[PDB]
Amino acid sequence: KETKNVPFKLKNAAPVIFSHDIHLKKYNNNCRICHIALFDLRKPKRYTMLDMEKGKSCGACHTGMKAFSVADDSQCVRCHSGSARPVAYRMKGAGEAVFSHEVHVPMLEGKCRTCHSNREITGGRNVTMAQMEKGKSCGACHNDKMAFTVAGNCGKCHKGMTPPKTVNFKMKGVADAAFSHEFHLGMYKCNECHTKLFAYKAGAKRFTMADMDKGKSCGACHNGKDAFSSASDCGKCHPGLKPAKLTYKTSVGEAYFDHDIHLSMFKCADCHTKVFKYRKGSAPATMADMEKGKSCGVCHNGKDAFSVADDCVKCHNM
Numbered sequence: 001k002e003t004k005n006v007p008f009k010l011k012n013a014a015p016v017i018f019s020h021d022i023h024l025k026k027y028n029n030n031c032r033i034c035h036i037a038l039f040d041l042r043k044p045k046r047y048t049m050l051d052m053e054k055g056k057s058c059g060a061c062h063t064g065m066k067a068f069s070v071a072d073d074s075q076c077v078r079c080h081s082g083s084a085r086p087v088a089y090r091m092k093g094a095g096e097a098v099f100s101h102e103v104h105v106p107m108l109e110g111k112c113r114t115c116h117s118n119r120e121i122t123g124g125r126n127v128t129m130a131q132m133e134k135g136k137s138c139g140a141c142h143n144d145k146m147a148f149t150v151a152g153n154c155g156k157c158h159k160g161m162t163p164p165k166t167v168n169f170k171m172k173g174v175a176d177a178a179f180s181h182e183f184h185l186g187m188y189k190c191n192e193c194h195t196k197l198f199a200y201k202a203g204a205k206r207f208t209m210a211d212m213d214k215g216k217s218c219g220a221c222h223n224g225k226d227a228f229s230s231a232s233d234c235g236k237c238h239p240g241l242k243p244a245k246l247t248y249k250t251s252v253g254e255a256y257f258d259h260d261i262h263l264s265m266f267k268c269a270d271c272h273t274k275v276f277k278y279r280k281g282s283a284p285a286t287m288a289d290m291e292k293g294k295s296c297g298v299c300h301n302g303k304d305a306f307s308v309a310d311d312c313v314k315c316h317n318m
């Protein structure tokens with residue numbers, strides 16, 4: 001008649017190869033047996049180990065009597081002759097998690113079933129860290145007793161994760177932005193932030209101070225209500241940054257803008273955002289403009305401060 005092997009595809013480990021060439025020399029070419037009921041063949045199904053113990057599938061001949069059991073906690077490898085294949089955890093928003101037998105077997109004995117029978121381990125699908133922090137799966141063991149708690153070592157199980165003590169933000173025109181994880185941890189839980197507020201990988205939309213006031217990034221908390229104002233105090237997130245005495249490179253010489261003199265009559269709010277950006281890389285306003293009303297002329301126009309027109313010496317060195 002001619003017929004041969006058929007494998008069983010398993011989403012999390014080496015497949016199981018059924019073998020006609022065996023169960024044939026035994027039953028003697030009788031077919032109706034496994035194919036009239038045991039295995040449909042027209043619209044077959046996927047059975048769990050249990051569904052076998054309960055008689056269905058291979059559990060309808062591999063009891064212990066006719067042929068060894070699908071329950072002998074030390075006679076599984078008879079079928080699951082597998083070649084290993086660490087477990088792949090792909091989550092839309094976290095470091096691909098991995099679990100593998102080869103480093104867990106030699107920790108109980110060869111105990112399989114301890115896990116594959118413990119409905120609170122191999123039960124749920126798409127488990128969470130909530131569900132897991134309450135003993136269900138993984139944290140069944142890893143629960144502050146048998147093994148390290150699950151409220152930690154995230155990099156141990158997940159791909160990369162493991163948080164950095166201090167993070168640096170490179171900036172052009174400003175300086176540098178320092179933020180401390182350590183200190184921000186003993187105050188919050190991962191998901192309070194990750195992912196909504198920030199991501200794990202290493203790219204995404206590099207927000208802007210302005211964006212913050214909307215509710216994103218540091219501004220999600222730093223706004224003057226929950227945490228300190230994303231508006232001022234600058235000397236916090238940005239190290240040495242300090243409003244100081246600049247020096248312009250102008251066609252007719254040098255221009256001088258002292259911050260101090262102005263910061264005794266004004267607040268960053270007055271100028272900055274609407275009138276003067278911070279980044280060195282701006283757009284040079286012309287004295288033509290400063291007369292129209294723009295730049296220094298927003299207030300420097302005789303009525304308020306004094307006009308750009310006259311007194312060219314005050315802001316210039318010629």
Ligand code: HEC
Binds near residue numbers: 034
């Ligand atoms: C008489 C010699 C047999 C014929 C005719 C067929 N089988 Fe089998 N068979 C068994 C299993 C575990 C499967 C898997 C089915 C599933 O996973 O859904 C199969 C598969 C087949 C197929 C496909 C053949 C192929 O080469 O792809 C057909 C059409 C089929 N079988 C015909 C189990 C058993 C079994 C239990 C001991 C016996 C005695 C036989 N099969 C015998 C025959």
Ligand code: HEC
Binds near residue numbers: 022057059
């Ligand atoms: C699910 C489709 C099955 C898997 C997986 C396996 N079988 Fe069977 N099987 C049956 C008998 C009577 C024997 C021979 C006698 C014995 O050694 O106990 C077998 C043997 C196996 C083996 C061992 C092969 C070897 O000689 O080393 C494996 C790994 C195996 N089977 C896997 C009978 C039946 C049967 C009853 C009609 C069914 C439904 C299955 N086997 C199903 C599977």
Ligand code: HEC
Binds near residue numbers: 012077080110116122
């Ligand atoms: C004795 C050495 C063991 C055998 C044989 C197998 N395991 Fe495991 N295993 C564990 C987990 C969390 C999973 C993932 C969830 C799932 O797969 O449903 C697995 C998975 C398997 C699978 C395949 C699963 C599938 O859907 O195809 C097989 C065939 C398998 N395991 C064989 C966890 C554990 C565990 C708890 C600590 C132990 C020690 C073992 N597994 C041991 C065995």
Ligand code: HEC
Binds near residue numbers: 211
């Ligand atoms: C006082 C008003 C502040 C000045 C001066 C600036 N900041 Fe910040 N800042 C913060 C972070 C995390 C970054 C990097 C953001 C990212 O990489 O996505 C920065 C960056 C800037 C920039 C560029 C973006 C923009 O145009 O707004 C400028 C010009 C800048 N900062 C000036 C964080 C913080 C923060 C911690 C909560 C505070 C209080 C400040 N920055 C304050 C100011």
Ligand code: HEC
Binds near residue numbers: 285286287310
């Ligand atoms: C009487 C009309 C004045 C003469 C002489 C000039 N200025 Fe000024 N000026 C000031 C700043 C901050 C700049 C730099 C602006 C930038 O970098 O975007 C300048 C630049 C110039 C220039 C270039 C513009 C042009 O081509 O016309 C010239 C020619 C120049 N300044 C001549 C600041 C001030 C200021 C301090 C408050 C006053 C009152 C004036 N400038 C007045 C004159």
Ligand code: HEC
Binds near residue numbers: 050058
């Ligand atoms: C050959 C008869 C097997 C023995 C012996 C054991 N398993 Fe098995 N297993 C086998 C097959 C053919 C299949 C699935 C086919 C299908 O219809 O889907 C499986 C499946 C599993 C599973 C998935 C089921 C579940 O976990 O809910 C696991 C995890 C698995 N097998 C584990 C396992 C263990 C630890 C065994 C001892 C209890 C065991 N299997 C023996 C075939 C065979």
Ligand code: HEC
Binds near residue numbers: 138142152
């Ligand atoms: C292994 C030793 C882990 C530890 C410790 C932590 N997690 Fe975990 N986590 C692990 C696995 C295998 C899974 C998959 C669960 C499943 O559905 O099968 C998870 C899943 C996550 C997820 C995705 C689900 C969700 O909560 O949205 C997240 C958010 C995640 N893990 C986060 C996370 C954090 C924040 C951890 C430490 C602070 C961490 N995990 C530890 C395995 C392990």
Ligand code: HEC
Binds near residue numbers: 163179181190201
């Ligand atoms: C809110 C105050 C946070 C909490 C609590 C946690 N994290 Fe965090 N994390 C936060 C920020 C502001 C940033 C910087 C953004 C950047 O892209 O650098 C991060 C960054 C990380 C990273 C590094 C990403 C990278 O640079 O490639 C990781 C992987 C990370 N955070 C992990 C992590 C873990 C596991 C936490 C719980 C212990 C945790 N963070 C909490 C802010 C916050």
Ligand code: HEC
Binds near residue numbers: 188192193220
């Ligand atoms: C809400 C979830 C926050 C996020 C995300 C960030 N910060 Fe934070 N930060 C938070 C709180 C609860 C406080 C309160 C204010 C206080 O007085 O501590 C803080 C504090 C800081 C500090 C202040 C240091 C000091 O005041 O002496 C720094 C250095 C700081 N935060 C920086 C910072 C940066 C740059 C962040 C985004 C990249 C960031 N924080 C996020 C709450 C939250």
Ligand code: HEC
Binds near residue numbers: 246257271279
């Ligand atoms: C006008 C009334 C201002 C006041 C008061 C403050 N700033 Fe200022 N700032 C102003 C100008 C004209 C410029 C540059 C214009 C250009 O586009 O080149 C600046 C620049 C800065 C910068 C970057 C340069 C530097 O000082 O290193 C920073 C860091 C800055 N200003 C910060 C800042 C802060 C902290 C203020 C309030 C406490 C503040 N400025 C007031 C104009 C005005």
Ligand code: HEC
Binds near residue numbers: 270296298
């Ligand atoms: C409106 C809010 C201002 C902006 C924007 C800038 N300046 Fe100003 N400046 C302002 C006032 C009201 C004054 C005080 C004197 C007065 O009669 O109004 C100042 C002063 C100066 C001075 C020195 C004056 C003194 O020492 O007596 C300089 C050096 C000066 N301002 C420079 C300057 C430049 C270059 C500006 C734009 C790049 C600028 N100022 C903006 C009000 C305002």
Ligand code: HEC
Binds near residue numbers: 097098115157
């Ligand atoms: C049952 C027992 C479990 C379960 C349900 C999971 N793990 Fe795993 N694991 C367990 C123990 C007690 C240990 C040893 C702890 C100790 O030394 O005290 C481990 C260890 C880990 C490690 C290795 C750490 C080491 O080398 O010591 C990893 C890689 C790990 N566990 C991952 C992991 C994942 C991803 C799980 C969910 C799929 C998981 N374990 C479940 C005990 C058990």
